[PDB]
């Protein structure tokens, strides 16, 4: 009976809402009223990584905070040495319809994929000098939106088929499938300790998943449009979202709700990317309007801007040592700022 179920779901939604409402005893702006604003944050362009020939769609820092890689519709997957600007590798892709990439913690692999619906793993230090695809991860029935390695043998993926998945790279098999999202999954982020991860989707919701158990613990609502980007807060008890509704939000896991919204009423274009600074004081967000905004994560004000791309900022990334923010753009350059 479709009636008795929608009627139950409705009542359970109201009951989740009232339980959440009776917990929201205070706002973050009250809690941080003693705290002073950060300075004007005025980061400078330290590097312009030149080489890609068309729109960059993604990028990811290596854990050493020096090597990064970037994926463009030009057909290339470039691993850069950000200190020098020298290209360490320029891997030609089989499918140029690329949408994500990932640098494995170990530095030994990168991953990449897009409208091919496949997450390709590339071996970086081989016997003899070549860089070759060591594994294709097929199974999704829609586009690969994001991917993140846990280690050399495990990678989590998100897709436009409405699911995420954990993969064993040796076997090429989906160990676990994460279902629940009712729209395309556009982004994901691993918790620091990699036992949980969060996903964001076109259903306007974010979900927290237990990797080992294979199930959704928590669904977070409030966004009015697609969640294009998502990032864990470094203590693991919170994350931030970027959406087409022009807002970033900060969600706390233990509260099971939104703590804060970051938006100006005169910014109405979509967010592409979000990243916390090392301490979490700053939330960086890229926009369709060509700029990054630097937000004070505590005070909800804009502290500064990274302005230096001639088309949209599509992706960004802060280093593990906190020394730098990388931007990637549709104008075909990446920039390193601090």
């Amino acid at each position, epitope marked *: 009976e479709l009636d008795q179920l929608r009627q139950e779901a409705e009542q359970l939604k109201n009951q989740i809402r009232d339980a959440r409402k009776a917990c929201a005893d205070a706002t973050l702006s009250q809690i941080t009223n003693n705290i002073d604003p950060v300075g004007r944050i005025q980061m400078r362009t330290r590097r312009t990584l030149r080489g890609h020939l*068309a729109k960059i*769609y993604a990028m990811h820092w290596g854990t050493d905070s020096r090597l990064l890689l970037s994926a463009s*519709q*030009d*057909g290339k997957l470039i691993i850069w040495d950000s200190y020098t600007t020298n290209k360490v590798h320029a891997i030609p892709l089989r*499918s*140029s*319809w690329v*949408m994500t990439c990932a640098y494995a913690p170990s530095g030994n692999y990168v991953a990449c994929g*897009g*409208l*091919d*619906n496949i997450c390709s793993i590339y071996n970086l230090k081989t016997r003899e000098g070549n860089v070759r695809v060591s594994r294709e991860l097929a199974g999704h*029935t*829609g*586009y690969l*939106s994001c991917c993140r390695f846990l280690d050399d043998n495990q990678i989590v993926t998100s897709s*436009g088929d409405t699911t995420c998945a954990l993969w064993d790279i040796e076997t090429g098999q989906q160990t676990t499938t994460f279902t629940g999202h009712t729209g*395309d999954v*556009m*982004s994901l982020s691993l918790a620091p300790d990699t036992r949980l991860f969060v996903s964001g989707a*076109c259903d306007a919701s974010a979900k927290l998943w237990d990797v080992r158990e294979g199930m959704c613990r928590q669904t977070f609502t409030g966004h009015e449009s*697609d969640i*294009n980007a998502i990032c864990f807060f470094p203590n693991g008890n919170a994350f931030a979202t970027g959406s*087409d509704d022009a807002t970033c939000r900060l969600f706390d896991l233990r509260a099971d709700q939104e703590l804060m919204t970051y938006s100006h009423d005169n910014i*109405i274009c*979509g967010i*592409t990317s979000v990243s916390f600074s090392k301490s979490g004081r700053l939330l960086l967000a890229g926009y369709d309007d060509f700029n990054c905004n630097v937000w004070d994560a505590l005070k909800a004000d804009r502290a500064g801007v990274l302005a230096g791309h001639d088309n949209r900022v599509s992706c960004l990334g802060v280093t593990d040592d906190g020394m730098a923010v990388a931007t990637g753009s549709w104008d075909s350059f990446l920039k390193i700022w601090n």
Partner: nanobody, 114 residues
């Protein structure tokens, strides 16, 4: 190394018809859903017509029955047949695969005069 090429827009009299095409440089339409969006002068971009990988269509209420979205996988093309056009359909129409994380065409301007 990729091209999403739109064509078929222009100026048409109210009640007339336009056949927008969207031609991909590869076989992307055969393993993904796609979407046609539009953006009028100083409003937000909205979905207009979408097609799943298996061929189920879905339209915005303002166009339902007038706009039909079809697909020819063997030539990496989709078509948006737009019939009995009205002034409020005037906008830039975009071809898309992969939503906001994905691939867009440059935009085709559609102008409907009375």
């Amino acid at each position: 190394q990729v091209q999403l090429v739109e064509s078929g827009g222009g100026l048409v009299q109210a009640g007339g018809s336009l056949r927008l095409s969207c031609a991909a440089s590869g076989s992307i339409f055969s393993i993904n859903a796609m979407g046609w969006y539009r953006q009028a002068p100083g409003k937000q971009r909205e979905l207009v017509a979408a097609i799943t990988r298996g061929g189920r269509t879905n339209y915005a209420d303002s166009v339902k029955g007038r706009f039909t979205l079809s697909r020819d996988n063997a030539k990496n093309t989709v078509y948006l047949q737009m019939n009995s056009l009205k002034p409020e359909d005037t906008a830039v129409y975009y071809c898309n695969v992969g939503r906001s994380r994905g691939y867009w065409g440059q935009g085709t301007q559609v102008t409907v005069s009375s």
